[PDB]
Design a protein around this ligand. Structure first.
Ligand SMILES: CCCCCCCCCCCCO[C@H]1O[C@H](CO)[C@@H](O[C@H]2O[C@@H](CO)[C@@H](O)[C@H](O)[C@@H]2O)[C@H](O)[C@H]1O
Ligand SMILES: CCCCCCCCCCCCO[C@H]1O[C@H](CO)[C@@H](O[C@H]2O[C@@H](CO)[C@@H](O)[C@H](O)[C@@H]2O)[C@H](O)[C@H]1O
Ligand SMILES: CCCCCCCCCCCCO[C@H]1O[C@H](CO)[C@@H](O[C@H]2O[C@@H](CO)[C@@H](O)[C@H](O)[C@@H]2O)[C@H](O)[C@H]1O
Ligand SMILES: N[C@H](CCC(=O)N[C@@H](CS)C(=O)NCC(=O)O)C(=O)O
Ligand SMILES: N[C@H](CCC(=O)N[C@@H](CS)C(=O)NCC(=O)O)C(=O)O
Ligand SMILES: N[C@H](CCC(=O)N[C@@H](CS)C(=O)NCC(=O)O)C(=O)O
Ligand SMILES: CCCCCC/C=C/CCCCCCCC(=O)O
Ligand SMILES: CCCCCC/C=C/CCCCCCCC(=O)O
Ligand SMILES: CCCCCC/C=C/CCCCCCCC(=O)O
Ligand SMILES: CCCCCCCCCCCCCCCC(=O)O
Ligand SMILES: CCCCCCCCCCCCCCCC(=O)O
Ligand SMILES: CCCCCCCCCCCCCCCC(=O)O
Ligand SMILES: CCCCCCCCCCCCCCCC(=O)O
Ligand SMILES: CCCCCCCCCCCCCCCC(=O)O
Ligand SMILES: CCCCCCCCCCCCCCCC(=O)O
Ligand SMILES: CCCCCCCCCCCCCCCC(=O)O
Ligand SMILES: CCCCCCCCCCCCCCCC(=O)O
Ligand SMILES: CCCCCCCCCCCCCCCC(=O)O
Ligand code: NI
Ligand code: NI
Ligand code: NI
Ligand code: NI
Lengths: 150, 150, 150
């Protein structure tokens, strides 16, 4: 300690992060369940198309997961916490729909993949705008002071 | 700067995080070593069951790795740093045992997969309790003030 | 709020993190593009060696991505922000070269894999040194006070 804490600046981000982990846990338990239904034992990640879709829906979500966390936290700190958290929920809800769709059909992964991309791209844009607002003033000022010499 | 820092609030979490990275590095060097022993060259992630087990033990640890980091940090900030760090070590030690076991035998991955799940689930529960202690008082208060109007 | 913020302690780390996410996004759009060129539809991650190389270059970068983020942030907080950010850029530029090389040829992945390992290992070493500078003084002091009793 510290007679102050900054938890109240990031608790929405932390809540959306936790929801994210729970969703990834669900995807994982669904793969375990597909291994049982389709008798596909580790090591070994191939089997019927219907087992491969569930496996692949989960692996896809897992590989985008750190991009989402990174971008969430940077947008939430540098741009606005509520906005970032809100895009976060939208991304996670689109990922649930991606996973459920892909499991039924490769073609049904597409509409929600696109919803999830719009939401991550918006987080990236908010992260860039916040970082630009952080760095640009001081860089322009320094450039200008440099020219000031009559 | 800053005439204060908050490093002393997260240095255990940071130490367990670093240990985590070193463990994932080890798993990776062990896959490189299995590629050599079994003459399985990239691209290409199939070969003898014994090469596939090492590959798969590493990929499994890598896909749960961000869930562990996310949950560690949220539990450590919102619930209690020492507790979270301690569950963290237990999870990582169980992941070493998972990797070593899975390499010998698919069946030997199971006991430590279950130890690692208990430890991650405890981190998730501590993260949820901390977030609940953060949000519930103010939400109940607002609900109640709403009713106060005689 | 808070009448102070600690954004100015981590904005380089946040910028390098954002650049990292954009690079991983690029790798992903390149896999989508290889699926089109080589007519390899999900689920399903095998096809011509040239499709498998692009797929695998991306999956490899994605699995090291959280190790990089973890290590970046710990080195940047506990050791020195500019140094960590700089090793960060070097790692990311080596990852671009890895991806481009691996896509052309499995053998062309090697020189930049090694550049990217040197840069991550340096981040790990800076993270360890910072954590050692944080923990060692107080541990040695406590050990010594323990002996002090005549
Ligand atoms: C930070 C943001 C990261 C960005 C990630 C980008 C993801 C979102 C943009 C996705 C657009 C790509 O979607 C695209 O993928 C594949 C082509 O290579 C195709 O995917 C298709 O594969 C088929 C056969 O090839 C079938 O298995 C499927 O039903 C599908 O129609 C789609 O017909 C196409 O629409
Ligand atoms: C946040 C927490 C995330 C939660 C992750 C959950 C992981 C921990 C719970 C794991 C329980 C699942 O374990 C389960 O997996 C597989 C079934 O689908 C089976 O795994 C089995 O596969 C076989 C044949 O099918 C063999 O390759 C193995 O020896 C094994 O016995 C197990 O017999 C079962 O016990
Ligand atoms: C925190 C840091 C994490 C550390 C990650 C370590 C990555 C960096 C060290 C990499 C060194 C390993 O590189 C090594 O991989 C493979 C052996 O198993 C081989 O990779 C080789 O595989 C071949 C046939 O087997 C071909 O597909 C390739 O052209 C290549 O030459 C290399 O001949 C070797 O040089
Ligand atoms: N990637 C998944 C996640 C679901 C999961 O973690 N399953 C556990 C128990 S079956 C496991 O050890 N998977 C083996 C593996 O990933 O190779 C899988 O393919 O199985
Ligand atoms: N995922 C592992 C990690 C071990 C590793 O990173 N190996 C390096 C050198 S062999 C690599 O370029 N792997 C190629 C790949 O992942 O496709 C692998 O399958 O090889
Ligand atoms: N891992 C990549 C990333 C590129 C990507 O995310 N593609 C989207 C649209 S084709 C997808 O749904 N991939 C299906 C999958 O990963 O199984 C892939 O193999 O396709
Ligand atoms: C890899 C995921 C990136 C995680 C980065 C999270 C680190 C945040 C560090 C500074 C937090 C300071 C409190 C917020 C200050 C503010 O909101 O203005
Ligand atoms: C994706 C991994 C999530 C990482 C989130 C880490 C960010 C921490 C930000 C606030 C830290 C403030 C110091 C701790 C305050 C306290 O312990 O009460
Ligand atoms: C999983 C990625 C690990 C992310 C950890 C990032 C959390 C940082 C928390 C404390 C930040 C306090 C501001 C910096 C203090 C300083 O530089 O001395
Ligand atoms: C603007 C408010 C955003 C709400 C985020 C709530 C997170 C819910 C996770 C349970
Ligand atoms: C001090 C040098 C800072 C350069 C950082 C620029 C980041 C811009 C991110 C958009
Ligand atoms: C710190 C003070 C900012 C100086 C202003 C530089 C002008 C460019 C901003 C538009
Ligand atoms: C309660 C204390 C927890 C200890 C965590 C130590 C981390 C060791 C990593 C080397
Ligand atoms: C201000 C709205 C906050 C809603 C967040 C609720 C998080 C609960 C997490 C358990
Ligand atoms: C901020 C003060 C908390 C108000 C108390 C609300 C009561 C519910 C807590 C149990
Ligand atoms: C020492 C300075 C390091 C510069 C990091 C700049 C990040 C650029 C990302 C755009
Ligand atoms: C209080 C106990 C602290 C033990 C942490 C040691 C971390 C060393 C990391 C190198
Ligand atoms: C806190 C004060 C540090 C006490 C000094 C312990 C001596 C070992 C450092 C070298
Ligand atoms: Ni005090
Ligand atoms: Ni001062
Ligand atoms: Ni005030
Ligand atoms: Ni402060």
């Amino acid at each position: 300690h510290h007679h102050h804490h900054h938890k109240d600046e990031v608790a929405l981000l932390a809540a959306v992060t936790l929801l994210g982990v729970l969703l990834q846990a669900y995807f994982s338990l669904q793969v375990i369940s597909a291994r049982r239904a389709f008798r596909v034992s580790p090591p070994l990640t191939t089997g019927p198309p219907e087992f491969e879709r569930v496996y692949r829906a989960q692996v896809n979500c897992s590989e985008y997961f750190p991009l989402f966390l990174a971008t969430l936290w940077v947008a939430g700190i540098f741009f606005h916490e509520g906005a970032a958290a809100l895009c976060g929920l939208v991304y996670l809800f689109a990922r649930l729909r991606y996973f459920q769709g892909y499991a039924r059909s490769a073609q049904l992964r597409l509409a929600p993949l696109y919803a999830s991309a719009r939401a991550l791209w918006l987080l990236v844009a908010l992260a860039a705008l916040g970082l630009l607002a952080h760095f640009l003033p001081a860089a322009l000022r320094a450039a200008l002071l440099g020219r000031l010499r009559t």
